[PDB]
Amino acid sequence: AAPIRVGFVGLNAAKGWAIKTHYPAILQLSSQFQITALYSPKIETSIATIQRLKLSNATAFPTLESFASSSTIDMIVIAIQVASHYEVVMPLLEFSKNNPNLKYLFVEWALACSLDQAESIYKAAAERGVQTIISLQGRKSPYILRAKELISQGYIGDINSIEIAGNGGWYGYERPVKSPKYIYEIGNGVDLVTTTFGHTIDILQYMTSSYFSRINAMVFNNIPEQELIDERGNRLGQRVPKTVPDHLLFQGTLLNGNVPVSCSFKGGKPTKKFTKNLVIDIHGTKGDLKLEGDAGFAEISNLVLYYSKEIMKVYHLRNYNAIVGNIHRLYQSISDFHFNTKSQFVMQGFDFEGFPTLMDALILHRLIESVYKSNMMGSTLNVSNISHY
Amino acid sequence: APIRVGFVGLNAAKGWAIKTHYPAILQLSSQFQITALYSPKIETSIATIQRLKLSNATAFPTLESFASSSTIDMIVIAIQVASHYEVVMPLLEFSKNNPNLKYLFVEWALACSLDQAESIYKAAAERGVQTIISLQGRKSPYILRAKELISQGYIGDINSIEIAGNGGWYGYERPVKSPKYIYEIGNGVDLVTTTFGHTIDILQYMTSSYFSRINAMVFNNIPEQELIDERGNRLGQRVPKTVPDHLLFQGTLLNGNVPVSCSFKGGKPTKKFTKNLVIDIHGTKGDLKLEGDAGFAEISNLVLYYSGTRKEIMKVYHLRNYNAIVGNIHRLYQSISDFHFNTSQFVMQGFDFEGFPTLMDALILHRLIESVYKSNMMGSTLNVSNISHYSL
CATH class of the missing domain: 3.40.50.720 (NAD(P)-binding Rossmann-like Domain)
Structure with a gap:
């Protein structure tokens, strides 16, 4: 070997x-x-x-x-x-x-x-x-690869529309005292949009074999001050600043087939009571295909995969x-x-x-810059060439 | 009398x-x-x-x-x-x-x-x-209950909201018996004005807040629908639709700057693994969700889910x-x-x-709808806060 x-x-x-x-x-x-x-x-x-x-x-x-x-x-x-x-x-x-x-x-x-x-x-x-x-x-993710196989083999036919929902984890109303204040401050390369959204939106583009076309985002900081809590989950009656986003509304179109995509990413807790915290709902002409988790983090979550004179199938490891x-x-x-x-x-x-x-990582970055740029300017942005130059 | x-x-x-x-x-x-x-x-x-x-x-x-x-x-x-x-x-x-x-x-x-x-x-x-x-x-009894709960601080303050609906007629197929006027532009009936209009109004009405900023994208990815008979078979003949078959809406409630995400599907196929109508409201002390199979809130029998009372009780309510x-x-x-x-x-x-x-409420609703189309054309988020005033 070697x-x-x-x-x-x-x-x-x-x-x-x-x-x-x-x-x-x-x-x-x-x-x-x-x-x-x-x-x-x-x-x-x-x-x-x-x-x-x-x-x-x-x-x-x-x-x-x-x-x-x-x-x-x-x-x-x-x-x-x-x-x-x-x-x-x-x-x-x-x-x-x-x-x-x-x-x-x-x-x-x-x-x-x-x-x-x-x-x-x-x-x-x-x-x-x-x-x-x-x-x-x-x-x-085995789940991401299966979904990819299915979609690329025309198993759900052409794609009609898509919805996504995720959770950043740390950016809810409360912060534990033990968590480093650096993941809550702007400019450190870690946050709801860059990290959590970045991962998920990449899998999407990778599952559907298409980059984006037009997009429009809104980025929120509706919790500027998080309430410190200990291990048990009790509050120390002390608030600390977060300058990093705690919600992302993203919305755009896949270049292939001009497919609408709707997105909503929650900062953190509470979790959703009547819906999985991670969802990718892909809708086709011959079928549907959906991934659910409870983490919010696709990249490190164990998902369930559903995919529809109809035959439905569920696949879970x-x-x-x-x-x-x-x-x-x-x-x-x-x-x-x-x-x-091989x-x-x-x-x-x-x-x-x-x-x-790293080239893939770069393109992902160009998309992320676009999401922030779009929020600032408050305008839909054409983003088709992102993957060239 | x-x-x-x-x-x-x-x-x-x-x-x-x-x-x-x-x-x-x-x-x-x-x-x-x-x-x-x-x-x-x-x-x-x-x-x-x-x-x-x-x-x-x-x-x-x-x-x-x-x-x-x-x-x-x-x-x-x-x-x-x-x-x-x-x-x-x-x-x-x-x-x-x-x-x-x-x-x-x-x-x-x-x-x-x-x-x-x-x-x-x-x-x-x-x-x-x-x-x-x-x-x-x-x-809708369901809409009024949701309104009572939210206004009584039962789910606490609102954190975020997702919505999903279905226009019904604007899928890949059209039955031969359906009047071609509901598929042509300018007739005051369509996925955005009608179906979205109703739903987005209930939202504003449940949450007691008009909108602030919004951004929309309006699609016509099915310009030609395939004619089908009663059984559901195709007559091998396509007819034009110039009216939208998908709406991506997205904005913020004036009260509490609450994010709202929206997706409205033209028509069939229906969603296989999700209800076709969904209002998913998320609060600080609880959640609240409405589901249907119609896509049309105004004339649908819904199910209402609501957790809350933080040792936390969940409740479902259905007539x-x-x-x-x-x-x-x-x-x-x-x-x-x-x-x-x-x-x-x-x-x-x-x-x-x-x-x-x-009719004043109807008018404001119209101002919002014009904004949704205007936003799509211009391709920009629009501030919409004054929509509900100006005695223009």
Whole structure:
């Protein structure tokens, strides 16, 4: 064999996000991925991490340059806060030239804090000439892929209309004291529109094999002050600012077939009492097709899939762990592409094969900028060329 | 002291009034009694008066003889909307020769355009009669309960709202028996004006708030419908529809800047995994949801879900075998009767429980509808807050 060596920036073996998605996944693929490097701001944390989980081949690097430069890395994975994506990726991309073996750059969604930073990063990566990857795992949910198979095989006929509803999670009336104030402040690349909506609206475009045409959005901050609550759920009688949106009304048209799409994303709690919190309701000429969850987060949720002299079918994987599962699949697809199981390439687009690159992430960003731009200007925007230039 | 009804549009075999107004008036025989009955062809009036044994019905020959008589207390216009202006304008004038006229009652839509609407309101307002508009949605038991709950803080303040409806006729197929006028532009009947109009009015009426900003997209993705017979088979022949077959609406309630998301489907196929009519209201202390299978709130038997009382009780409320086609209209009449006898002539109902929707309410509704189309054309969100004032 020949396991792809992984260099990890952001693997904290106690906190963060990667420890609960990437790590478990890499484990279950021990012959194809093995963690080699591990940079962190404080090198102490790297060693502590390498020790907690008995990473046999992990080597705690001291600086960014020593880490990005080593030849023991085949794929680099950036899993830190989005706010730090630009500061870290840009230099790292440069230092990595001293490594002839680098074959894969892997970054978590969102890619940056703004269209601009996004454009910069893509360029910096494209010119370096490495295969890029974006953690849009939505594209790997078994449910998302089935829905895609069905729709592309004319199983529901042509699409007539579409409704969507999601939940951002954190942006309701209350905030727990333990939650970092950075996910509630503007400009940090994490929020209801960029993160939650971004993921979902990408799966949609990916399921239906169509980018958007015209769109119009309205972005709300009707909870400027959240009420602090403890663990039990009680209030400490203290309000803290949120400058980040707590509701999104999106609305537009798929380029293919001028298909109406209606969207509503709820900030957070309370949850919906009489409707699933995540819903993708696709309506066709020969049938319907609908995905439900209780999370609001498609990318890491276990869904149910319904799809209609009529024959209705429901499809559900009982006890399927989507938090690890979808990520796992993404890795599995990287491995498949590497050992040539089933050419370096620029973007996945609507293809089944391969995986979402940074180019896909970029286009997603162009759509997101449009959603905000549309809200500000208060006008429907033609967005057809977003996926070119 | 029965109220003497003059009916323009009561065809005792076809039309709409025969299946709503008529049955309702019957069940209120002591408070409403049909006296007059104008029609284009006086023959049809007599035929109608004869079919249903209307004891006091008098078939009038001309519009002027009908509008002018003193045997009418309330006039009810129930003809096609396309003919509302031609008929109402002159009739309003002739009716001056009748000192007893106390009520003008008109079916929604009121006119074919904002302009015609403005004209008619003026022509009515200056005549000085109490106007009424057939927005029966405001009388659905389900709509009134939802209104009680929301206004009593039962679901707390409103956080957000989703709506979904169905126009009925504007799918991929058209039956050969359906009049081509409901599929042509400019006739005051269509997915936006009619179906959306009714629903969006109930919303504003349930939540006691007009709109603030809105943005719409109006579709004609089926320009040619496929003709089908009774069984549902195709005659292999396509006919034009120039009227919308989908509406994306989206805006904000003036009260609490509440997001509202909307999607209205042209027609068939129906939705396989969701009710075809849905009003999903979300609050801070609870939710509240209305479902139907019709797509037409105003004439549908709904189910009402409402959690609340935060150790949290959910409740469902449904009137089994309640005929909404007749029921809602019936309620509207019942409320006119209540107001007349007094179980203070008034300009508009607004968000009040008491009374009934007047022509002023109909007008505002029209201003919103013009905005929806205007917004689609211009492709921009529109501030709409003053819609409910300006005595323009």
